[PDB]
Amino acid sequence: DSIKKTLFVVIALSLVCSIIVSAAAVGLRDKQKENAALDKQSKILQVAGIEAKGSKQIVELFNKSIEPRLVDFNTGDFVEGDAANYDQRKAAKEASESIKLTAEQDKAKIQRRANVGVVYLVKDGDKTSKVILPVHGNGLWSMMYAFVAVETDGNTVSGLTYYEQGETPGLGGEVENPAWRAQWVGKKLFDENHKPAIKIVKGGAPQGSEHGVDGLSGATLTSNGVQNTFDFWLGDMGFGPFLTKVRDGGL
Amino acid sequence: MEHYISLLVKSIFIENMALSFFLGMCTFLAVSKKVKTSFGLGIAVIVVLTISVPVNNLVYNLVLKPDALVEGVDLSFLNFITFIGVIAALVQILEMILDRFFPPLYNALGIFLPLITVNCAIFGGVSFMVQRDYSFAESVVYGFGSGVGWMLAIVALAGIREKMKYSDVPPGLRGLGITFITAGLMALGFMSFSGVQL
Amino acid sequence: MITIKKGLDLPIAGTPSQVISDGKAIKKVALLGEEYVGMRPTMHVRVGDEVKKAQILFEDKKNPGVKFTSPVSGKVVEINRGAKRVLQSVVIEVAGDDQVTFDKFEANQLASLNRDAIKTQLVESGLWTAFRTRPFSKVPAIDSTSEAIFVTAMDTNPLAAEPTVVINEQSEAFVAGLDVLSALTTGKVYVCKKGTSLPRSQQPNVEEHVFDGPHPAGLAGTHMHFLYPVSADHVAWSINYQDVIAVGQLFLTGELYTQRVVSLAGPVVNKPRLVRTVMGASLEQLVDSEIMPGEVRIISGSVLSGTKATGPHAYLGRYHLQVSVLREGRDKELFGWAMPGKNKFSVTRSFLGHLFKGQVYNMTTTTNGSDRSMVPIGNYEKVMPLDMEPTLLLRDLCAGDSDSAVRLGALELDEEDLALCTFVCPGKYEYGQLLRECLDKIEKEG
Amino acid sequence: MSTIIFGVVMFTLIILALVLVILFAKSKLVPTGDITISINGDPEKAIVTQPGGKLLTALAGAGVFVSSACGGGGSCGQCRVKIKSGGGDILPTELDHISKGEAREGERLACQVAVKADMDLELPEEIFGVKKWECTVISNDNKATFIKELKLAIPDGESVPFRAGGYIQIEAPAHHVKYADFDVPEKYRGDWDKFNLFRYESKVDEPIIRAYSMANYPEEFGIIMLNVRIATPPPNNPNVPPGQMSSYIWSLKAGDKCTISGPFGEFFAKDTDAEMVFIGGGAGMAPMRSHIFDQLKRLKSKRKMSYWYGARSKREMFYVEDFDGLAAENDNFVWHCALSDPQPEDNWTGYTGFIHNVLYENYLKDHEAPEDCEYYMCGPPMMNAAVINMLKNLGVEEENILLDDFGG
Amino acid sequence: YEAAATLFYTPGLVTKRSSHVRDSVDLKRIMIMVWLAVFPAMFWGMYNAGGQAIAALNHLYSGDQLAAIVAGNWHYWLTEMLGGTMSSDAGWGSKMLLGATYFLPIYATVFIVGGFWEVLFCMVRKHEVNEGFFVTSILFALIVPPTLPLWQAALGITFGVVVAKEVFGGTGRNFLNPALAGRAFLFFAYPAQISGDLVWTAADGYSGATALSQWAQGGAGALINNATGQTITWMDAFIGNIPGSIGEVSTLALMIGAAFIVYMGIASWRIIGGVMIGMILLSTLFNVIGSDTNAMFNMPWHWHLVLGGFAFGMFFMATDPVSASFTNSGKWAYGILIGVMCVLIRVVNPAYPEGMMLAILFANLFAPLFDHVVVERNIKRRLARYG
Amino acid sequence: LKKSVLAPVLDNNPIALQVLGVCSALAVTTKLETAFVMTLAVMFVTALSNFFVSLIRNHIPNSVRIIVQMAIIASLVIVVDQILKAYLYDISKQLSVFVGLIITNCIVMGRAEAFAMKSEPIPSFIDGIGNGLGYGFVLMTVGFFRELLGSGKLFGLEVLPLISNGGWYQPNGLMLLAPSAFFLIGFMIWAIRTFKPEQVEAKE
Ligand SMILES: Cc1cc2nc3c(=O)[nH]c(=O)nc-3n(C[C@H](O)[C@H](O)[C@H](O)COP(=O)(O)OP(=O)(O)OC[C@H]3O[C@@H](n4cnc5c(N)ncnc54)[C@H](O)[C@@H]3O)c2cc1C
Ligand SMILES: CCCCCCCC/C=C\CCCCCCCC(=O)OC[C@H](COP(=O)(O)OCCN)OC(=O)CCCCCCC/C=C\CCCCCCCC
Ligand SMILES: Cc1cc2nc3c(=O)[nH]c(=O)nc-3n(C[C@H](O)[C@H](O)[C@H](O)CO)c2cc1C
Ligand code: FES
Ligand code: FES
Ligand SMILES: [Ca+2]
């Protein structure tokens, strides 16, 4: 019958293509995962202040100096777990691991906050010199993600880096400008009364201020985004309890 | 109810498939000569996409999703072949059903079904669906809205090209060049919904 | 009553005096061969041939059996041929008084005659060319029939004559022509007139429909669109009141009636009035010593739809009932386009001339501008009473889409139906020629 | 290796299920019965076909050969049929070649109709009477430097019934012919030797079908006379191959075998008492001779006729004897020949120049009414264009200009 | 000098065919009547630009700082040289000088570049250069901030003339608005010289928001003029004592100019009424349903009219005959869509303060479909033998 | 021969003459590296698909021909996707959806149907490489122009010093958006049909 030839052709073709596809796919999963992790590793290395070129140097210096850890937002305590492969965005998406935010608390317009978040500790020897808090917030066209490196004293910022911004490349995408990023080194997060104090000043910052950093020019709708991002992720439902525990002592 | 109105209006206006995502341009730029054939092709695309998105959602969530069948087994590398096969099979079977049982519907819009058996619009729709992780009802609404937006765009371009019978285009741009420039001006116009977040 | 509100009564100086006075002697007539739409003639005469009245001059190759006969007896003196030997006129010099006569009936019997006998006498005499079908404005085939025959007993053209003045003179002939049409008209006859009473036909086929409004409220195309819309399947014939008088006289007396009463008027005519003439008379002899000194244009018909009567075409057309003379304007003006026009006419309101009411203008033949593209500022809508989309149909005519124009209503129009649209165009387009091209394409492809 | 097995099995299963559902939907919801092609409503003759195929190929495999010349790609446009109810659509090439006047009555191209519905045809009675013939060659003698006369012999005491002005197609097997094998006399061999055409040759692999116009009026029985020209490579590219069927016919000699297939025609003399004007040139002498001899012998008409033949030189003038006989016996027929460039050996005392200009200057300029005549025209494309231009300039309607263009 | 033979003198031609008498109007009369209607807007725009600049300058600097600042900018020292003054007591003449120093270079650049491109195209296609470019040039030069770079104006007018109009066959043969397609080129390409707080008052070092950006942030109580420290009233935006694009600020002047071209039959009162209907309906709906966080949800219909470039575009740019709808009902639908989209982009779109160029560019795309619907409803009436 | 490779570059161009292949040309031309990688991937997939379809041209059933051809094409594109994800991870993240849309790319299927089913294995490879070159011509031209004018960079190398990194050039923000690709391709078509006037589409 004519069914025999068509069935034979289809079966043989599917067998060959299946062997080839499934052999090529399963064989490279480990390389794909390594590549996926390498980008975030390089970003955290760049924020921490370390210099590394190439996959080998990146992986070596990341295993040497940086130690990922999980922290509970509601209580500000470290929790045991596999902090290396934790995925905070899926943790926020899933309902059992996240909470819905009210309009009085959702200052950063994220609409969902996870219960456990990862923080990276920069270590020189046994002592921890910096903690790299991951923060994010909404802007005018997209959700902006950042890596802020807070020193051990709990206030002084040692750097900033936006690794996912998605805004106009010459108005509000200046959050990736090296000068704007370097404007952050030395600023203090909290005031004397342990309150959030970072201020995105519109029109220039008074030279010498510790809480003032220059706002973006021609983009006040994406400077409000950074201001609200820090207003939320420095508050009581963000890194507030953890930062209080760090400021007290015993990082 | 308010969650699906947002998806409908989004897929129709805020995220156009033709002018914003550039899906299916060859037929969009070739069959745009007459409003009648453009309307027929738009209806065909609406039907095919509305049928194709939810069936592929079912197949994905049942088989291809990580750990769906057996824990620790991820068969996500079959997404492309599975989607394209389901699309082609559904298109062919619908073409045959309409040609046999409903000759009027066939001579109306089933004449276009061979053109969209393998079209970037539907494949990109299914890919965006698996990227955005829609439920079944969200897949239905997204497919319908995307089809309606594609049809609106192609019918607008057909109306413009039929108004352009009074134009005097240079010989080098007569044909494809002026159509490209017209679609570009249409995208420049459709950029009105840029800042909206629906 | 059908009341038209979208139109334009063009104010032009020289409105004629509605009294009929005898006219100057005519010594040459002619049959203009280019005014008959889609005709290719077979000449039955030669230069130097003595003819009699209603003797055949040429036949149509495309319309088998239609005979074009001489208006008067005389001698064929010219056969003017243009570019590609296209016929322009057959000029006959009036002489003698011979004629070809036919069968005469009593006025009682005219409504009961047979359609075949009526058709036979009409085609033998040459009044079959008085009809014009719609669509395509051609002479009807001798083997075809029509349900709607429209008699145009009104005239809204500028400087036009008054139908009532002539019908009050030959009421018996008008009624006889109506009664003959009643037996030729298998469906019906429509006598489209104004509010003023006319002679009446006792037959129930003959109906009197009153139209009231500015131009084009007196056009057979408007009458057809409002009483019997035409298409490829439904065709209607149109004859005017003077040709109906002539048909009545023919069927009553047995001899052709070639007399005409036309309107000689214009901004450059000394004493505008109505004059008695003969079909196809010589216009350069008709306006001899009745024009102001200068350079003028003589036109057969109105200024909206006429024929420049110079040279071989300086003869009264078949379907024209007036002569319009107006000065020829070629002068250049410094910043004339930007003048506040107290003496300038427009359908827009960008001039001061619209503020003064009842003003008549000494218009000339100037195109007040140069040819440009169509920027539609809403002009063609103010002058189109019919139920069409004016600017879309005109833009499809300009583009050259004949199928789209037939869809949008080009099969209901004559070159006289777009005269106001040609008038009010800021791009100086001419839509009658484009309509004729579209209709030629439609007639050829089929 | 635990994922690879699931991958191969899942891929095979999905593809197999898709293929099987496709086949199952095709089996049930696609018809496979029979379709009847009623070629005419009156007779019982109807053809049963499967839905897969073409209307033209179906009619051919049945045996009713419609009139076509090229045999493919709609380049001919002669495979016309009238369908009352059949394949309900019209193709762009059909819009290109026919008008809406042919649509309403039901005419349609036989080449591009899809046979999936029950069809009702109305063919002209001419298509029924087209027999496939076998013939022997009587003579293949030259008449001009590039024109060669082929006289076939129709067997079994029958004559092809055809109107004057028709044609018959010719078939040929695959072959390979040498130009040196041509039989060319020494008088016409001049330009042959001078251009060195004998180096050419032609090779074909498949049966070929070309058409040629009969050169005798139907009363001349038993003989089929043709006039074929040698279609040498054009002077722009002398490197291309030569003509196939022209070389085949030039290869044919006495006693050989060749086939002709049915009388066709679309170029006939109109019925009227009007003056006739025959404008011929090149190989158009064949239909022109058919027409004139038909008129003067079979119908015995008294219409004022004329003939104007244009050649290059007196060497290319043929058929002078019978035309002198006709012009002498009848006072209706008068024929004039015009030489483009006569040689010194010609000793020519007559009309010289291009035939359109000669006709216009000598006849149509002083003519009373050139628009009342019937014009029959057939020759080279340059002559056709020039004469059509002259006639259209003289105010002549396309319904008087009757034209036959060799492979238009 | 061959152009002076065409522009100064009447052509001097006669008719040839069916209509032996023509109407006195032509394209030149129409285009110059539209070019003259925007002159009050242009002059008030120059005056307002000069006045706002002088006020913002005397607000920031004083004494020795004013001299050093006016010695820097050629606009300011050229005003001082020609005879005006930059002090706070400057009359209406010193302000129009300062506004002309900003408007005239932009207008000259736009005119020269667009004229070059149009002359090139009309020379290559063997046509005569037609009016209809004066309107595009003047509109593009008046819908742009007082502080555009001249190379940006050149690029924008190049894109507007060549790509939007001249590449389709000239005037009357395109489907898009050339002047608003050249501003959409500059808005999406170089969007910082045409947006924000530093481009609208031509004062060196002055940063201030306009009133469709101050309403969004705080409402009707946030309409404050920082230069003078005074509240912005409705009579200020209506008359036009507000910052913005050169000649869009004076709704009174725009009404005075547009009333003439509407009376004369050039502009479409159907399109204007459609725009007003659409904006009133949508603004009333937003005012009814209301919202707490959004402060544009409570802007009345008579505040939408006087702020932004609504009146400029409703009066002079929506009424473009070539890009509008050719049917009398399509015109109503076109205007309604323009107004609806303008109010929508104003209220629910957070990135763009207004929406009149982006609403007209949408309606330019969707007008042929309205004409199609109307003509198709008309054809069914003909097949039924009632038309 | 060599003409079989070099004719689809200008004489019969995919994007510029036979509309096939527009959806990726509009999208992936914002960056020259992505344009180059897409050109290479399209060449690879089209050539190998043509080769295999021509190998099995005779045994392909008619009712499931599309399924067989699309199975081969999808296998090729899936292998390409798994290779790119492992060795060029940054390019694939930007090429996210059009890597998969290589399957529905009209060039691959149109060449597998028009030329592969009716030709030999070796010439099909040549036709595929030629059509890939013709695709990459337009891809690389539009990518060059867009990346140069809109970012001042070529392949990521600073060619024009941007004004924010203390320079003289201010980039074009429209060369990163949707409209610019349509205009670039339309003007490429104009410039192509100017020098080759046999491609001009006759009136009406
Ligand atoms: C109704 C009708 C009647 C006809 N009557 C006659 C008649 O009486 N006499 C007559 O001679 N013809 C007649 N013809 C024309 C006939 O059909 C042929 O067209 C003609 O005879 C030439 O035949 P052929 O063998 O050369 O055909 P072909 O071999 O198909 O034609 C080849 C011709 O084309 C040229 N050519 C082919 N390929 C190329 C190439 N690649 N580059 C350049 N040139 C190339 C050759 O040089 C040669 O001239 C008639 C046609 C029709 C339709
Ligand atoms: C169509 C021709 C061209 C356009 C010509 C338009 C002429 C219109 C008539 C002249 C308008 C003169 C209006 C003078 C305003 C008087 C000032 C006044 O009394 O107050 C205005 C008062 C509101 O004041 P508040 O701001 O609320 O003050 C308190 C603050 N909360 O009401 C108004 O705003 C009046 C609106 C101004 C006139 C609007 C004119 C319409 C514009 C042209 C549209 C054409 C008509 C189409 C209308 C379509 C309607 C469906
Ligand atoms: C009432 C009227 C309004 C016009 N508005 C514009 C406009 O907004 N932008 C423009 O470029 N041209 C405008 N023009 C000029 C003309 O319409 C424009 O050049 C056409 O678009 C030519 O294609 C206008 C003309 C008139 C008569
Ligand atoms: S004959 Fe086969 S296609 Fe025309
Ligand atoms: S790429 Fe060819 S159709 Fe989408
Ligand atoms: Ca969507």
Contacts of C8 (CB under 8 A, 6+ apart): C214, C215, C347, C382, C383, C420, C423, C424
**CB–CB of E188 and F170 under 8 A?**
no
**Neighbour-count burial of E369, counting CB atoms closer than 10 A to its CB (0-12 exposed, 13-18 middle, 19+ buried):** buried
Contact assessment for residue F88 and residue B98, using Cβ atoms and an 8 Å cutoff: no
Distance E314 CA to ligand 3 centre (A): 13
The two three-digit tokens of residue C359, written as one number: 């003003």
Q: Which atom of ligand 5 is nearest to the CA of F106?
A: 2
Give the Cα separation of C112 and A232 in Å (integer).
103
Instruction: Give Cα D391 to chain centroid, integer Å.
Output: 24
**DSSP codes of every residue in D200-214:** -EEE--S-EEEEEEB
Q: Is E8 helix (H, G, I), strand (E, B) or coil?
A: coil
Q: Which helix (H) or strand (E) holds A122?
A: strand A116-124
DSSP secondary structure code for residue D344 in this structure: G
Mutation probe of ligand 5 site: the residue of B19, B26, B31, B122 with most atoms within 8 A of C-beta: B26
The two three-digit tokens of residue B50, written as one number: 């509305």
**CB–CB of F173 and E185 under 8 A?**
no
CB-CB: which of B73, B74, B89 is closest to D18? B89
**Neighbour-count burial of D148, counting CB atoms closer than 10 A to its CB (0-12 exposed, 13-18 middle, 19+ buried):** buried
The two three-digit tokens of residue C171, written as one number: 């009421």
Single-letter amino acid code for the residue at E370:
F
Burial per residue of F144-154, b for 16 or more beta-carbon CB atoms within 10 angstroms, e otherwise: bbbbbbbbbbe
Separate counts of helices (H) and strands (E) for chain C:
10, 20
Contacts of D67 (CB under 8 A, 6+ apart): D78, D79, D80, D126, D127, D264
Give the Cα separation of E164 and E120 in Å (integer).
16
State how beta strands C188-193 and C148-152 pair: parallel
Q: Which residues of E touch B194 (CB under 8 A)?
A: 349, 351-352
Count of the separate structural domains present in chain A: 1
Give the Cα separation of D76 and D79 in Å (integer).
8
Contacts of D2 (CB under 8 A, 6+ apart): B72, B73
Q: Which of D72, D94, D129 is the last residue of a domain?
A: D129
What residue ranges do the domains of chain F occupy? 1-204
- Which ligand has the nearest atom to the CA of B198? 6
CA dihedral D27, D29, D30, D31 (to 10 degrees): 100
> How would you classify residue D53: left for phi > 0, otherwise alpha for psi between -120 and 50, otherwise beta?
left
Q: Is A38 helix (H, G, I), strand (E, B) or coil?
A: helix
Q: Which atom of ligand 1 is nearest to the CA of D76?
A: 53
Where helices occur in chain A by DSSP H, the ranges are 2-27, 29-48, 54-65, 88-93, 178-182, 223-233, 240-248
- Comparing CA positions, the residue from A143, A142, A170, A160 lying closest to residue A198 is A160
CB of E108 closer than 6 angstroms to any ligand 2 atom? no
Burial per residue of F52-76, b for 16 or more beta-carbon CB atoms within 10 angstroms, e otherwise: bbbebbeebbebbebbbbbbbbbbb
Beta bridge partners of D224: D152
Give the Cα separation of B45 and B51 in Å (integer).
10
Contact assessment for residue D358 and residue D342, using Cβ atoms and an 8 Å cutoff: no
CB of E299 closer than 6 angstroms to any ligand 2 atom? no
Q: Which residues of B touch C398 (CB under 8 A)?
A: 166
Does chain D touch chain E (at least 3 C-beta pairs within 8 Å)?
no
Tokens 């695309």 locate to B45
> How would you classify residue C29: left for phi > 0, otherwise alpha for psi between -120 and 50, otherwise beta?
beta
Q: Which helix (H) or strand (E) holds A146?
A: strand A143-151
Write phi, then psi, for E350 (nearest 5 degrees): -75, -10
Using the Cβ of A111 and the Cβ atoms of chain F, whether some distance falls under 8 Å is answered with: no
Please count the other Cβ atoms lying within 10 Å of the Cβ belonging to residue E220: 15
Give the Cα separation of C185 and C147 in Å (integer).
6
Does chain C touch chain B (at least 3 C-beta pairs within 8 Å)?
yes
Write down the experimental method used for this entry.
cryo-EM
Where helices occur in C219-293 by DSSP H, the ranges are 220-227, 241-253, 283-286
Domains and CATH numbers, chain C: 2-20+102-253 (no CATH), 28-94 (2.40.50.100), 367-444 (no CATH)
Give the Cα separation of C210 and A114 in Å (integer).
84
Contact assessment for residue D200 and residue D233, using Cβ atoms and an 8 Å cutoff: yes
Residue D289 belongs to domain spanning: 266-408
State the helix-helix crossing angle for B120-132 and B35-59, rounded to 10 degrees.
40
User: Residue D139: inside a domain, yes or no?
Assistant: yes
CA distances from E302 to E274, E284, E296 (A): 16, 10, 13
What residue ranges do the domains of chain B occupy? 1-198
How many CB pairs below 8 Å do chains A and D form together? Answer: 34
State how beta strands C87-94 and C28-31 pair: antiparallel
| Pocket, ligand 5, Cβ cutoff 6 A | B 24-26, 119-120; F 20-23, 104-106
**CB–CB of A25 and B195 under 8 A?**
no
- Comparing CA positions, the residue from C9, C298, C336, C340 lying closest to residue E13 is C336
Contact assessment for residue C32 and residue C317, using Cβ atoms and an 8 Å cutoff: yes
**DSSP codes of every residue in D87-148:** -----HHHHHHS-HHHHHHTEEESSS-B--S-EEEE--HHHHS--B--EEEEE--BSSSSEE
Using the Cβ of A100 and the Cβ atoms of chain F, whether some distance falls under 8 Å is answered with: no
Where helices occur in chain F by DSSP H, the ranges are 3-10, 22-27, 32-55, 65-87, 89-94, 96-101, 106-111, 121-151, 179-195
- Which ligand has the nearest atom to the CA of B49? 6
Q: Which atom of ligand 3 is nearest to the CA of E172?
A: 23
Distance E179 CA to ligand 3 centre (A): 8
The two three-digit tokens of residue D23, written as one number: 């086949």
Q: Which helix (H) or strand (E) holds D152?
A: strand D147-153
Q: How far is D87 from chain A (nearest CA, A)?
A: 30
Contact assessment for residue C164 and residue C198, using Cβ atoms and an 8 Å cutoff: yes
Contact assessment for residue D188 and residue D145, using Cβ atoms and an 8 Å cutoff: yes
**DSSP codes of every residue in A4-21:** HHHHHHHHHHHHHHHHHH
The two three-digit tokens of residue B153, written as one number: 């765009």
Q: Which among F84, F142, F180, F182 is the top mutation candidate for probing chain B, defined by the most B β-carbons within 10 Å of its own β-carbon?
A: F182
Q: Is D164 helix (H, G, I), strand (E, B) or coil?
A: coil
Give the Cα separation of E359 and A81 in Å (integer).
54
DSSP secondary structure code for residue E202 in this structure: -
Question: Is the preceding peptide bond at A178 cis, omega within 30 degrees of 0?
Answer: no
**CB–CB of D99 and C445 under 8 A?**
yes
The residue of chain F nearest to residue D11, with distances taken between CA atoms, is F71
DSSP secondary structure code for residue D61 in this structure: H
CA distances from B113 to B31, B108, B116, D79, D355 (A): 13, 11, 5, 31, 58
DSSP secondary structure code for residue D51 in this structure: S
Contact assessment for residue C176 and residue C251, using Cβ atoms and an 8 Å cutoff: yes
- Comparing CA positions, the residue from C350, C351, C331 lying closest to residue C341 is C351
On whether both D52 and D74 belong to a single domain, the answer is yes
Binding-site residue numbers of D for [2Fe-2S] cluster are 70, 76, 79, 111
CB-CB: which of E188, E350, E368 is closest to B191? E188
Give the Cα separation of D378 and B43 in Å (integer).
54
Q: Is A188 helix (H, G, I), strand (E, B) or coil?
A: strand
Contact assessment for residue E187 and residue C387, using Cβ atoms and an 8 Å cutoff: no
Return the beta strands (E) in E92-237 as ranges: 224-225, 230-231
Q: Could you tell me the end-to-end alpha-carbon distance of chain F, in angstroms, rounded to an integer? A: 37
Beta bridge partners of A112: A100
Contact assessment for residue A181 and residue A159, using Cβ atoms and an 8 Å cutoff: yes
CB of E263 closer than 6 angstroms to any ligand 2 atom? no
Q: How far is B61 from chain C (nearest CA, A)?
A: 51
Residue A129 belongs to domain spanning: 26-251
Give the Cα separation of E178 and C324 in Å (integer).
45
Resolution rounded to one decimal, in angstroms: 3.1
Please count the other Cβ atoms lying within 10 Å of the Cβ belonging to residue B147: 28
DSSP secondary structure code for residue D342 in this structure: -
DSSP secondary structure code for residue C207 in this structure: E
Distance E277 CA to ligand 3 centre (A): 23
User: Residue D5: inside a domain, yes or no?
Assistant: no
Chain breaks in chain C (C to N over 2.5 A) after: none
Where helices occur in D294-380 by DSSP H, the ranges are 320-329, 355-359
On whether both D125 and D136 belong to a single domain, the answer is no
Q: Which helix (H) or strand (E) holds E304?
A: helix E301-304
Contact assessment for residue E56 and residue C341, using Cβ atoms and an 8 Å cutoff: no
Q: Could you tell me the end-to-end alpha-carbon distance of chain A, in angstroms, rounded to an integer? A: 77
User: Residue A3: inside a domain, yes or no?
Assistant: no
Using the Cβ of D254 and the Cβ atoms of chain A, whether some distance falls under 8 Å is answered with: no
Using the Cβ of E5 and the Cβ atoms of chain A, whether some distance falls under 8 Å is answered with: no
Contacts of E72 (CB under 8 A, 6+ apart): E204
Please count the other Cβ atoms lying within 10 Å of the Cβ belonging to residue A54: 9
- Comparing CA positions, the residue from A183, A177, A118, A195 lying closest to residue A157 is A183
Contact assessment for residue C367 and residue E11, using Cβ atoms and an 8 Å cutoff: yes
Contact assessment for residue B143 and residue B52, using Cβ atoms and an 8 Å cutoff: yes
Give the Cα separation of C313 and C323 in Å (integer).
13
Q: Which of D220, D243, D265 is the last residue of a domain?
A: D265
Contact assessment for residue C38 and residue C245, using Cβ atoms and an 8 Å cutoff: no
Q: Is C422 helix (H, G, I), strand (E, B) or coil?
A: helix
Contacts of E359 (CB under 8 A, 6+ apart): B192, E337, E338, E339, E340, E341, E342, E344, E345
Write phi, then psi, for A238 (nearest 5 degrees): -120, -120
Q: Which residues of C touch B166 (CB under 8 A)?
A: 374, 395, 398-399
CB of E7 closer than 6 angstroms to any ligand 2 atom? no
Give the Cα separation of C55 and C109 in Å (integer).
27
Tokens 């066939």 locate to B106
Contact assessment for residue E350 and residue E289, using Cβ atoms and an 8 Å cutoff: no
Burial per residue of E252-262, b for 16 or more beta-carbon CB atoms within 10 angstroms, e otherwise: bbbeebbebbb
The two three-digit tokens of residue A202, written as one number: 């519109």
Count of the separate structural domains present in chain D: 3
Contact assessment for residue A146 and residue A162, using Cβ atoms and an 8 Å cutoff: yes
- Comparing CA positions, the residue from A154, A73, A167, A170 lying closest to residue A114 is A73
CA gyration radius, chain A:
23
Q: Which of D235, D265, D295 is the last residue of a domain?
A: D265
Q: Which atom of ligand 2 is nearest to the CA of E262?
A: 2
